[PDB]
Ligand binder design. Sequence first.
Ligand SMILES: NCC[C@@H]1CCCC1(F)F
Length: 330
Amino acid sequence: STGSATTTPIDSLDDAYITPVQIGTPAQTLNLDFDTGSSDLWVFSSETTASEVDGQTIYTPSKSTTAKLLSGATWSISYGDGSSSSGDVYTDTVSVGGLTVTGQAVESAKKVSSSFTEDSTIDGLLGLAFSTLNTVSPTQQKTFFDNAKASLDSPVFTADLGYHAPGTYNFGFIDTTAYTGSITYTAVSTKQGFWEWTSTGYAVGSGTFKSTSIDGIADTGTTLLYLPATVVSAYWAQVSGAKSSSSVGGYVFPCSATLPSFTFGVGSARIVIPGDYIDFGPISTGSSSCFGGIQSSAGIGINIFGDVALKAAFVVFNGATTPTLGFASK
Ligand SMILES: NCC[C@@H]1CCCC1(F)F
């Protein structure tokens, strides 16, 4: 089998991407944030505290003839931005882009933190990291990809995120028309539960490439590119007036600037992020200070190749017995 679904930016900045997902019988379509950095499929639901729902579409398990309570199971997750959610668990039929999994754990939120409530465009998350990170207790549950894997034509999914435009998540096949040149594959460590890999270096603009190993994760659920402070300082030093602002929470730059590109290495290959992809717009409405799309990972404990990086590439998440990542230009 295969599946193919379009993923759409939630706003004009590409702050996140939503993909329609069919849950239950008859189908209830919710728009989920596909997150290769986590491993829970959770949704706003008829069980979510009413004051914490503000415009989201909810899953109502009582209206699904295929829903079954997963008796005794609970879940609770916290993310790197400090947001969180928790609740109980149903199994149900879940389809993405024509690919159907029966018996998928659908984690129904009883509580969500304020940042989820305040984002009316995201109805939940669909985790695509390794199932070892799934938070369901006392019986850990498998991701949608892990459940689908054996049925897929090939044990892979691909992320093709757009810059200020829709893109595609495919399951089970590699669309050879969706990228240019060849795909360069690179080793993955699953020791932390992530799609963790080692970039071979970077360049700023037209500058010379610096060969240096940068361990990090491919994370569709993180907006920006988070890299070591040395690398990030070298980038922003090429932008007149850019500075790190503690009050804002990262590097800002004059909105009048033209940003240089940023290149990262994948083995001997190179992925070029155009400068415009690094512009996250005014820090507040009407400000002439703009927020940068490359930020330091110093406070995080891990480097994160988030959407800013991934949207410059066609990315293969290869879930074979030994997982690997592939990157192509597009
Ligand atoms: N997108 C899931 C959240 C990520 C995983 C590693 C660091 C982080 F919390 F930011």
